[PDB]
Amino acid sequence: PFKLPLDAYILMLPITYASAAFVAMCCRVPTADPETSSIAYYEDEQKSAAAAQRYDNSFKQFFDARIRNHKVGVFQ
Amino acid sequence: MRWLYSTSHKDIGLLYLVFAFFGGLLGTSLSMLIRYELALPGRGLLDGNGQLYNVIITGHGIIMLLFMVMPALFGGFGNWLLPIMIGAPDMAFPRLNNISFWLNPPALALLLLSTLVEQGPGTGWTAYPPLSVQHSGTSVDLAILSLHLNGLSSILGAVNMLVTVAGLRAPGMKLLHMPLFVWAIALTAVLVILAVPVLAAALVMLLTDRNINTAYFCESGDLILYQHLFWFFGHPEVYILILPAFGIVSQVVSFFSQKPVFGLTGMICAMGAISLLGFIVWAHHMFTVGLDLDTVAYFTSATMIIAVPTGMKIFSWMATIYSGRVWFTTPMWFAVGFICLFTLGGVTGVVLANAGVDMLVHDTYYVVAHFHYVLSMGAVFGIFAGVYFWGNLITGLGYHEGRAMVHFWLLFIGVNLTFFPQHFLGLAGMPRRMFDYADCFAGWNAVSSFGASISFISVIVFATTFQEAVRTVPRTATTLEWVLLATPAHHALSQVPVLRTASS
Amino acid sequence: VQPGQLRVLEVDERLVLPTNTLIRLLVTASDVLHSWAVPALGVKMDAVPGR
Amino acid sequence: YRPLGDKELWHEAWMYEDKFGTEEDPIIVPSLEAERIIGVTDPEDETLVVWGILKDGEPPRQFVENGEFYVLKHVEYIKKVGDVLEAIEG
Amino acid sequence: AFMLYDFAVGLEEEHHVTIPPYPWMRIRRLPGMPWGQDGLFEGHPRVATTWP
Amino acid sequence: DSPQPWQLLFQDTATSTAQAMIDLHHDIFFFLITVVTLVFYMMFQIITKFHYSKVLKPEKLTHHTTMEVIWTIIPTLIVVMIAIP
Amino acid sequence: HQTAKEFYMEHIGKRHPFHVLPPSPWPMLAGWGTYVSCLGMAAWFHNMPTGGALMAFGMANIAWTAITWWRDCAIEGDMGMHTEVVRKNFISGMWAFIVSEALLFVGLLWACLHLGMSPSVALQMQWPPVGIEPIGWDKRALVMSAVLAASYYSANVAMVAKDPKVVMGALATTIGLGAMFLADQYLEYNETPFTITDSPYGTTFFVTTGFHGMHVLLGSLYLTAALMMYKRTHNAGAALKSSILYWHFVDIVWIAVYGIIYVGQY
Amino acid sequence: ARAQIERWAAEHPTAPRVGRIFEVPLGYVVPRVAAGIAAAGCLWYMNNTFLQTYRPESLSKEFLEEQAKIGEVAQRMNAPPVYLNPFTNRIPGSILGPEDAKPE
Amino acid sequence: YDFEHGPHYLQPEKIPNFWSKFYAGTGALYAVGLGVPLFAVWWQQSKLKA
Amino acid sequence: KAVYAPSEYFKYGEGASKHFGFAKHVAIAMTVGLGLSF
Ligand code: HEA
Ligand code: HEA
Ligand SMILES: [Cu+2]
Ligand SMILES: [Mg+2]
């Protein structure tokens, strides 16, 4: 309808970020460890452990170097 | 016959306003038993009954959420004010508007009947299984069927509202010239239509688990699934109850400042951003149930984004008051109070969004103090701002300004002294939904129970404000309901008004 | 209770945990939902039947 | 008359007139009754709307500042422009 | 054509595959059903009784 | 360990995790105090300085692009400053 | 009465093209019928005697109230109270109702996706559970998909035709094809080797397919009611278009139902 | 924008326009809110006095004085006692409990 | 008064004894809305005390 | 002689905001808030 003002695109940047993060989080769940309809998935220990550690490390590995340095606050 | 067979929107809106007042009275009565059991350590007037306390808090939460604020803002001011504000002669479906209202007394009757059957529905307003499933009897079924009927009522009302705004506007009036209350009601209708059927599906699953021996949420089911579906409904539900308050506050602040609303398109975009973000943040109610850390991470990061549109709305209201000619009346004090005190309700929501902090204050009275700031002081102040604003148009009765100021100051003092001490209780670790507490929590509990009685007194004083009105003749206004006579005719806008764009 | 004890908060059998030691706590429930919350340790996790 | 393309055929023009109402030549508003509500936008701002009431038998009246003047006229039929006068296409 | 073929090849075939009473089979949180003992539309119950 | 009468803030801690949570809460409260102070002071001054006994007739001020962008972009930086810890 | 039409033309009809209704008794009766049927349903859940009869009594009253309400709407259509913009608003309201029913089915299939994807230790982490023989896609369900696609195309014929005989025959073919989808779902419900009480698979299968079958029955009855208004005056207006829209919605819902439950085994 | 203001001021004649922020005088408002606060206090006092079915024995003055003798001290079934909440009561880190202190 | 075709759909200065019935209805509304929960408390606690 | 609409607004700057000092008050508010926060 009307012309969106200059604020609403500064609004739309974290909104697009949040929508993309939501889509990614929805997508990466059926490609994770416990979403297997069998007990025979875990009898292959190498692939199961590799897949589960891959699911562990993604989005956490961007935070390990500041977890180790106690960057858990705005100030110290 | 007039009030049973109505097809006019102004009568159905007034019926909603009265029904909402009755629901507020019932909830205020249920809220004094809570604060009178919780005044002192030990066992109060409930004689050490915990099932009865759970029934009382369940009924109180459901009534004050669904049967007070929702019929007052959405069904009450929306049905009365929407077709006048856009210039429509009526609603699009006038008999659907009547069944929208008339499914609410059966729902309230079933909810009140559930309290008298067996030991009652002591579950909380969220009704988490297997506590809802373990309850022998019939009361929980009646409470959930009350929820179904209220949800169908809201869906049908939103259908009528959305077809009315889309297809019955005045000629020459586009979606740019509507005032912000119309935009708020339209976005509320969109949220209702999208969110309520998820609750309907969740409650159908609950009924089949309780009564049909199914496996939705059970031993072989998944109990986190109910919380997922319920909070996917329930977080849009709390923005359904707050957007018409934003619209009312915009109308009131614009009126008495002698100024138009600052940043109209920014206001509409902020309301739309709040509406869109409300569907993707819902698992901020589920930080302690055992979700994976990436899910918790996303829902922490996404929930904090809702602060920016709300901050723009607040600063735009303050810029609307800025550089005006402001005359402070009783509805004006209920809007300045909204702006100053909804800020205190939102800043604690930012704290609750951060999941690390939420590990300490989940299911404590910090949560309760937050959501009684945003509801008892954001939505109730919005309801009462419009009663002293549009009351002579809607009912035909004036009000005394002195007794209204007495009522406002009593309510303002009684709510800042009831829930401000509930922050300190929750930070120190007092849990929710409990009637017997530890001996050291006594001082703030005593102060809060003192504030609740002041709130009850302000509820009593409100009945004495009405008086006879003085009727005048209109010439010009900025909105279409302030050129009508008070009260308007049964078919207001005898000629459909048109909006003429000048040569500019 | 007796003086020196806290009303409501006191139990008959406590939980004994050593310090300076990594402890794994597995929280579950048998009939309905519960939640194990100790605000001093910063632990609050819900007890779900099946989890 | 303004271009009737993208105008609904029942919007009753006079609103779509090609004139700026002055004091010495107002825009004549037709009405079925002695009074009628019309809405005029600000000439310097499309977003601002002022609704006014015109009465039968009155002088010219201006609603917004630096706006058009208006005079109401009681008629028994209002030309529903879109099939009344462009079907005439005079 | 295939649906009219299906309407004549309906309730004629039989299954005698008894199923042991697993914990997820024939849930009875409340005793019986609102209409009787067996489920609705169920004329040939499969889960076994007298589980040897 | 145990709650105390007339207590305002959190209890004392025995793990580093809970102390990290409390420090994060106090870091958020740092920003909240400034936000509430700015809102309350500006509301008081706008209320007192624009009463109709002071103002003959109002001014036309519907938009201000710079201030709108400023109060849109400052809280987003605060959100991202809070979020990473 | 004879001046009631004159008053309407003088004050409402000649001033705006929208429809203003006289006062009506059916919303109140429908609401209290919902009250009676909810009491009967709650009594029938827990085997209270004379509870199922009370639930049937309340449902019969709601059905009668809705039938008389819709007969009044049909009468008001036949006397020319609806202009074109009113019929456009009717289709808009049907679109909003379709969106609400769509989110109801989204919430229903969310449960299938959640429960099927990650089986729990209570099921001994096996999906589908042992004992359960799932219904295959290579059988009668494929015949159902073919029949319902044929019903989609035949309902699409009657939307665009201008010969009244073509419209009536296409509507009757669509209704008869919808009735074969339900008479065969009854055969699935009779031959299936599991119950709604047997595992979350049986639970989700029966609840979701039952809701879809109820929507098929409602759409078939709505298409039947839209045909008899055309068999009389050779004009249906919004009754034909909205029933076709609802039928196409039911067809689209079956795609998700088939592709999540029957193909994905969820 | 001014005309609707003047119309609302005519339909609400009890709302004054005298040139001050609180248009209704405080001599009217303060006594009535004081009376309402007093009535609320009477209701709160009536609830405290007449509406209790069990007063806990841990709030009696004998229990309170015997507790104040002990202090913020917790016993252990496997160890010496410990001071509760050592940061707010400023116990130094060398001192763990009452009995392990053994004052000089 | 003519609510359907008169100038006002609600004429509260023309019901005879309006301010008496208005206060009676307001009092009855306050009585029911503040006394229904107390009856529910009394009903459940009278069933245990049996 | 016709009915004229009156002058309803000043332009932003020559009315009663020329003596407000908006930036000064924002600086004072931020100073007080930062002092309390520190
Ligand atoms: C609409 C939201 C709303 C409102 C307004 C209130 C109002 C109040 N509430 Fe609360 N409350 C809840 C929503 C609300 N509440 C919810 C959702 C729960 C949780 C239930 C659960 O856990 O299941 C809860 C529970 C709750 C608790 C926690 C109890 C527990 O944890 O067990 C407490 C404790 O102090 C409390 C007290 C009060 C008090 C003293 C008021 C006072 O403000 C008293 C009310 C005074 C008013 C003035 C409001 C009435 C308004 C009108 C009468 C206006 C109507 C007028 C017109 C329509 C014209 N209520
Ligand atoms: C009126 C309804 C309403 C509204 C509007 C809100 C608004 C918000 N709420 Fe809340 N909430 C509830 C009703 C509401 N809530 C209810 C009923 C519950 C409990 C449910 C139950 O369990 O019973 C609840 C509980 C709840 C939880 C779950 C906690 C728990 O139960 O364990 C969370 C977590 O994120 C949350 C956060 C927020 C946030 C971030 C906002 C935001 O929208 C607030 C945004 C506003 C501001 C932030 C202030 C304005 C901003 C500025 C002035 C700019 C400056 C700001 C910054 C610089 C950041 N609230
Ligand atoms: Cu929420
Ligand atoms: Mg919880």
Side-chain angles (χ1 to χ4, degrees):
Chain A
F2 59 99
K3 293 179 179 179
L4 303 187
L6 202 68
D7 304 329
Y9 305 89
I10 306 170
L11 267 70
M12 95 176 284
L13 292 177
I15 287 170
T16 314
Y17 188 80
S19 291
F22 186 64
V23 170
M25 185 197 64
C26 296
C27 177
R28 63 176 297 165
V29 161
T31 67
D33 171 82
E35 310 288 331
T36 64
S37 300
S38 287
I39 200 55
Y41 175 75
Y42 291 108
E43 71 193 3
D44 197 291
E45 275 103 325
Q46 296 179 327
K47 199 257 176 185
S48 300
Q53 284 305 111
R54 192 174 336 125
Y55 178 71
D56 264 331
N57 290 340
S58 59
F59 271 82
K60 187 188 285 186
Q61 69 203 3
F62 310 130
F63 287 101
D64 277 27
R66 48 186 294 114
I67 282 173
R68 290 191 280 104
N69 286 130
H70 308 308
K71 300 298 187 180
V72 181
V74 171
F75 291 167
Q76 77 274 18
Chain B
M1 310 281 95
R2 160 169 203 200
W3 308 104
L4 305 189
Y5 301 152
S6 195
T7 56
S8 181
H9 66 105
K10 289 193 306 305
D11 289 11
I12 296 171
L14 191 57
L15 282 151
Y16 271 108
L17 288 173
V18 171
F19 182 79
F21 194 59
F22 180 60
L25 284 176
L26 286 169
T28 306
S29 178
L30 271 173
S31 168
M32 295 301 127
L33 310 175
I34 288 157
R35 276 327 290 172
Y36 277 0
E37 186 64 31
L38 266 296
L40 272 184
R43 295 159 67 180
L45 73 164
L46 289 181
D47 205 84
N49 204 350
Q51 167 77 90
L52 190 61
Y53 183 75
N54 292 347
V55 162
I56 279 173
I57 60 169
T58 306
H60 166 255
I62 296 175
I63 281 166
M64 293 290 267
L65 274 184
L66 299 190
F67 299 99
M68 191 265 283
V69 177
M70 161 186 159
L73 291 172
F74 189 60
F77 282 92
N79 268 336
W80 202 97
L81 269 172
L82 180 69
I84 303 180
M85 210 165 281
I86 67 171
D90 209 357
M91 289 294 171
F93 311 105
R95 287 178 288 174
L96 186 63
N97 199 12
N98 213 35
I99 196 171
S100 168
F101 175 74
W102 268 103
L103 280 157
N104 269 295
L108 190 51
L110 281 156
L111 179 61
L112 292 175
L113 203 81
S114 65
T115 71
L116 315 166
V117 175
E118 291 287 320
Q119 285 88 18
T123 46
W125 88 276
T126 52
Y128 279 1
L131 184 53
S132 302
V133 189
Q134 201 190 35
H135 274 58
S136 195
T138 318
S139 302
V140 182
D141 308 316
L142 305 166
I144 302 164
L145 285 180
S146 176
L147 297 170
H148 284 108
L149 292 185
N150 179 257
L152 178 57
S153 312
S154 187
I155 288 167
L156 294 191
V159 162
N160 194 5
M161 290 281 192
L162 266 191
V163 185
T164 307
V165 182
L168 281 83
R169 284 204 320 281
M173 203 190 83
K174 60 178 74 54
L175 306 157
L176 185 157
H177 299 119
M178 322 192 303
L180 287 173
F181 186 61
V182 179
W183 274 111
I185 290 289
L187 292 161
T188 308
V190 169
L191 293 180
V192 160
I193 281 177
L194 292 171
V196 179
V198 181
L199 168 79
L203 295 180
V204 159
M205 295 166 204
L206 201 43
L207 259 69
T208 53
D209 273 341
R210 283 197 38 97
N211 308 287
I212 302 299
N213 298 339
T214 67
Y216 268 115
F217 314 114
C218 65
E219 301 173 350
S220 56
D222 208 314
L223 302 166
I224 307 299
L225 178 54
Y226 184 89
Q227 312 199 13
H228 273 303
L229 298 162
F230 193 88
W231 287 115
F232 186 75
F233 152 73
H235 194 66
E237 179 59 86
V238 301
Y239 286 106
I240 280 149
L241 305 172
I242 205 68
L243 282 160
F246 296 152
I248 282 184
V249 161
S250 297
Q251 303 300 140
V252 168
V253 161
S254 179
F255 194 98
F256 292 98
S257 277
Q258 206 174 335
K259 270 189 70 174
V261 194
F262 191 93
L264 182 70
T265 59
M267 272 287 190
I268 300 150
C269 291
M271 289 198 286
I274 279 153
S275 305
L276 167 65
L277 278 170
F279 268 99
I280 55 172
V281 293
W282 76 95
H284 61 278
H285 302 274
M286 302 157 73
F287 287 162
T288 72
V289 307
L291 298 177
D292 287 359
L293 290 172
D294 279 322
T295 295
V296 175
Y298 159 69
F299 277 102
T300 307
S301 53
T303 312
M304 270 184 286
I305 320 180
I306 305 169
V308 178
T310 310
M312 277 161 61
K313 290 193 62 71
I314 288 175
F315 271 104
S316 287
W317 282 322
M318 297 176 78
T320 310
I321 313 179
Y322 176 76
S323 187
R325 197 171 169 281
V326 177
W327 171 46
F328 296 97
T329 60
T330 307
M332 194 51 178
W333 285 121
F334 271 101
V336 166
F338 172 84
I339 298 160
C340 276
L341 298 160
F342 184 78
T343 310
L344 284 178
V347 292
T348 60
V350 163
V351 168
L352 285 171
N354 296 262
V357 192
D358 198 80
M359 297 288 153
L360 302 179
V361 295
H362 175 60
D363 285 330
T364 73
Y365 272 84
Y366 195 84
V367 176
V368 176
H370 154 72
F371 76 78
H372 282 87
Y373 282 173
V374 291
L375 272 164
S376 301
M377 300 165 77
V380 172
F381 270 38
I383 286 168
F384 272 122
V387 164
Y388 297 120
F389 190 45
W390 289 302
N392 66 306
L393 266 290
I394 292 183
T395 47
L397 313 169
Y399 74 93
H400 196 248
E401 176 90 331
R403 304 187 217 114
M405 284 309 296
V406 163
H407 155 81
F408 158 72
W409 279 120
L410 279 191
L411 187 63
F412 172 81
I413 290 178
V415 299
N416 284 317
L417 190 151
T418 315
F419 307 114
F420 194 69
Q422 296 191 336
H423 276 311
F424 315 130
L425 291 164
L427 289 184
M430 183 182 173
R432 276 174 63 176
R433 311 178 168 184
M434 281 177 181
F435 66 98
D436 204 340
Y437 53 97
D439 292 7
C440 68
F441 289 132
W444 302 122
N445 275 278
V447 175
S448 167
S449 293
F450 192 83
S453 290
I454 312 183
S455 284
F456 181 78
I457 291 305
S458 75
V459 169
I460 294 308
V461 171
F462 171 64
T464 67
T465 51
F466 288 100
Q467 65 172 14
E468 265 193 359
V470 190
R471 176 193 293 132
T472 52
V473 296
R475 294 304 281 154
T476 46
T478 65
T479 53
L480 194 53
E481 76 278 335
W482 293 112
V483 297
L484 298 193
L485 287 170
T487 51
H490 193 226
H491 289 308
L493 319 169
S494 75
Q495 297 201 87
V496 164
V498 307
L499 183 45
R500 176 190 162 88
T501 304
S503 301
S504 312
Chain C
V1 294
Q2 286 176 3
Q5 283 160 341
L6 299 168
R7 204 189 52 99
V8 187
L9 311 169
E10 192 76 34
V11 296
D12 54 349
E13 289 293 325
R14 305 186 170 187
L15 172 74
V16 186
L17 297 177
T19 63
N20 296 298
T21 302
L22 186 75
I23 306 178
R24 169 162 64 224
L25 310 172
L26 299 182
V27 185
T28 187
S30 49
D31 48 358
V32 295
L33 295 180
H34 303 281
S35 190
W36 201 81
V38 187
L41 318 168
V43 170
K44 182 197 293 293
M45 209 154 195
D46 299 13
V48 182
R51 290 175 69 89
Chain D
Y1 274 62
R2 282 163 199 191
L4 277 296
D6 196 0
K7 307 298 167 64
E8 304 287 327
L9 306 192
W10 55 277
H11 278 177
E12 299 163 27
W14 59 260
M15 60 190 284
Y16 301 131
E17 201 158 283
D18 283 334
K19 211 182 84 172
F20 195 86
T22 53
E23 183 178 0
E24 72 280 344
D25 197 45
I27 283 173
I28 296 91
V29 174
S31 182
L32 296 178
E33 292 175 357
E35 65 182 1
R36 167 170 217 177
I37 308 167
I38 72 161
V40 184
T41 53
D42 204 349
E44 73 159 42
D45 209 312
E46 191 69 29
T47 61
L48 307 187
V49 181
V50 166
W51 307 88
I53 287 159
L54 286 157
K55 282 187 167 69
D56 181 33
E58 278 200 349
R61 169 168 290 251
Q62 192 186 55
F63 286 142
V64 287
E65 195 188 36
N66 295 118
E68 298 170 348
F69 284 82
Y70 295 89
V71 165
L72 191 143
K73 189 175 167 63
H74 192 284
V75 296
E76 295 267 47
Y77 184 76
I78 292 175
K79 277 194 288 292
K80 295 180 177 67
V81 174
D83 203 74
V84 170
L85 53 87
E86 71 179 2
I88 283 183
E89 57 205 281
Chain E
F2 278 117
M3 199 157 277
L4 286 173
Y5 189 84
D6 190 30
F7 287 147
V9 70
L11 72 165
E12 298 292 326
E13 267 313 300
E14 48 188 2
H15 310 105
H16 295 284
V17 192
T18 53
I19 301 170
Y22 297 109
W24 51 81
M25 300 292 286
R26 181 177 181 170
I27 309 182
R28 282 305 184 270
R29 205 156 41 247
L30 278 72
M33 298 310 290
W35 41 80
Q37 279 295 102
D38 302 348
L40 197 79
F41 301 135
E42 173 175 346
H44 300 291
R46 297 294 181 192
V47 175
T49 59
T50 71
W51 180 228
Chain F
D1 305 340
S2 73
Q4 294 193 350
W6 291 43
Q7 194 182 352
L8 309 182
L9 298 170
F10 295 90
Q11 297 183 20
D12 289 327
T13 46
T15 59
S16 52
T17 308
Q19 195 57 46
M21 302 173 174
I22 294 177
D23 289 351
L24 184 56
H25 172 272
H26 297 175
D27 278 322
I28 296 157
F29 209 58
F30 175 85
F31 294 114
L32 297 191
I33 285 163
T34 305
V35 162
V36 168
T37 310
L38 171 71
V39 163
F40 274 42
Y41 182 84
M42 281 322 270
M43 177 61 75
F44 167 76
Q45 287 276 358
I46 283 161
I47 277 166
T48 55
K49 290 291 173 67
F50 300 117
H51 197 242
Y52 63 91
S53 63
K54 303 286 184 68
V55 176
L56 187 62
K57 58 174 72 174
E59 290 167 344
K60 216 169 185 185
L61 182 84
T62 312
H63 72 285
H64 195 283
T65 317
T66 301
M67 286 311 299
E68 287 175 13
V69 167
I70 280 171
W71 61 64
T72 307
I73 200 79
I74 291 174
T76 318
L77 297 180
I78 302 176
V79 167
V80 65
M81 274 188 282
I82 289 161
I84 313 168
Chain G
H1 182 267
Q2 64 274 341
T3 193
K5 179 163 163 161
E6 173 260 323
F7 199 90
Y8 200 106
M9 299 307 169
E10 194 197 307
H11 285 94
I12 301 164
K14 265 65 174 175
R15 310 217 188 182
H16 60 82
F18 308 103
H19 181 223
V20 169
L21 278 158
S24 197
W26 321 122
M28 181 190 70
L29 298 165
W32 290 112
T34 56
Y35 181 75
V36 170
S37 56
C38 280
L39 294 171
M41 193 188 306
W44 173 76
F45 286 164
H46 303 288
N47 209 4
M48 281 177 184
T50 74
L54 179 68
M55 183 190 50
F57 174 78
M59 283 176 181
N61 278 280
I62 294 168
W64 198 280
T65 309
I67 278 158
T68 312
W69 189 338
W70 287 326
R71 208 196 57 106
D72 276 25
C73 281
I75 286 164
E76 291 159 353
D78 277 333
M79 310 274 303
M81 303 299 286
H82 306 152
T83 63
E84 198 59 62
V85 61
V86 178
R87 272 170 271 131
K88 295 194 291 184
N89 294 338
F90 282 138
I91 307 299
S92 282
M94 176 68 45
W95 263 113
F97 185 68
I98 283 170
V99 169
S100 299
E101 294 286 326
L103 276 296
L104 169 69
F105 265 104
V106 164
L108 266 179
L109 296 160
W110 191 332
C112 297
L113 291 190
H114 186 105
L115 289 181
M117 210 173 289
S118 196
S120 70
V121 177
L123 300 167
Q124 306 181 24
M125 49 203 284
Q126 299 214 21
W127 191 271
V130 183
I132 297 292
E133 297 180 337
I135 309 300
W137 60 270
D138 55 346
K139 213 51 185 62
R140 155 190 323 131
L142 202 56
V143 187
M144 291 178 182
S145 300
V147 168
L148 192 63
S151 79
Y152 179 91
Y153 278 118
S154 56
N156 208 359
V157 162
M159 183 59 207
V160 73
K162 298 299 184 290
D163 189 29
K165 181 65 175 65
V166 176
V167 180
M168 286 192 292
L171 281 163
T173 302
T174 304
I175 291 153
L177 281 174
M180 291 183 77
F181 185 81
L182 290 178
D184 201 41
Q185 189 79 94
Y186 175 76
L187 284 179
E188 289 183 353
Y189 282 3
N190 279 300
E191 308 285 332
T192 176
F194 49 92
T195 316
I196 198 166
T197 56
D198 296 348
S199 87
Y201 175 75
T203 294
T204 48
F205 167 76
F206 275 118
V207 168
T208 307
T209 51
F211 261 80
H212 173 72
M214 185 260 284
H215 285 81
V216 171
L217 190 46
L218 291 189
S220 175
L221 289 173
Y222 190 26
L223 277 168
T224 308
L227 171 65
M228 321 304 301
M229 290 187 249
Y230 203 82
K231 189 261 290 180
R232 177 172 156 264
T233 59
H234 291 340
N235 193 10
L240 177 68
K241 191 172 158 66
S242 70
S243 65
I244 285 168
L245 199 55
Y246 187 78
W247 189 254
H248 286 349
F249 162 72
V250 172
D251 297 330
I252 291 178
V253 165
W254 173 249
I255 280 156
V257 167
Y258 186 73
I260 291 177
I261 293 176
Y262 285 86
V263 186
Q265 305 284 284
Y266 290 146
Chain H
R2 187 172 172 82
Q4 43 169 27
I5 284 176
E6 294 292 312
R7 179 190 176 271
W8 201 90
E11 308 214 338
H12 295 87
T14 58
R17 301 203 317 188
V18 296
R20 73 192 173 222
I21 302 170
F22 295 94
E23 300 274 359
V24 175
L26 287 145
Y28 184 85
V29 193
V30 176
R32 279 152 185 83
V33 303
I37 286 165
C42 279
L43 287 177
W44 166 72
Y45 176 72
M46 282 173 192
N47 177 45
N48 277 320
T49 316
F50 317 105
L51 285 182
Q52 307 292 334
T53 187
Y54 170 73
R55 323 195 154 276
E57 287 91 349
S58 75
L59 288 177
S60 80
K61 60 183 294 294
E62 279 72 40
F63 203 104
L64 288 203
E65 287 301 318
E66 194 156 337
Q67 178 76 51
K69 284 179 178 66
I70 293 155
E72 305 192 3
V73 168
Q75 300 288 304
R76 293 187 269 172
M77 275 81 73
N78 308 292
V82 64
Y83 289 129
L84 289 170
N85 294 97
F87 304 119
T88 180
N89 311 331
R90 294 291 186 267
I91 295 92
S94 59
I95 294 165
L96 180 65
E99 299 295 323
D100 268 354
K102 283 177 177 180
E104 314 290 328
Chain I
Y1 72 109
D2 204 8
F3 68 100
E4 269 165 300
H5 305 292
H8 313 283
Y9 80 109
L10 271 188
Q11 193 90 40
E13 58 259 16
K14 281 193 190 294
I15 297 89
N17 276 306
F18 168 70
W19 282 121
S20 306
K21 298 177 201 150
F22 171 75
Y23 282 140
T26 310
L29 193 67
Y30 267 77
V32 174
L34 296 169
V36 171
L38 314 176
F39 175 74
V41 173
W42 172 86
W43 176 263
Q44 293 280 352
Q45 273 194 354
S46 299
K47 197 189 292 183
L48 294 189
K49 241 174 166 174
Chain J
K1 267 79 67 181
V3 173
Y4 276 106
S7 62
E8 206 164 17
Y9 301 96
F10 286 163
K11 186 66 175 178
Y12 180 75
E14 76 255 10
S17 73
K18 187 170 62 71
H19 294 311
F20 185 68
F22 178 74
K24 164 183 167 178
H25 286 321
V26 174
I28 284 174
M30 285 302 291
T31 299
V32 168
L34 279 168
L36 299 174
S37 289
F38 276 146

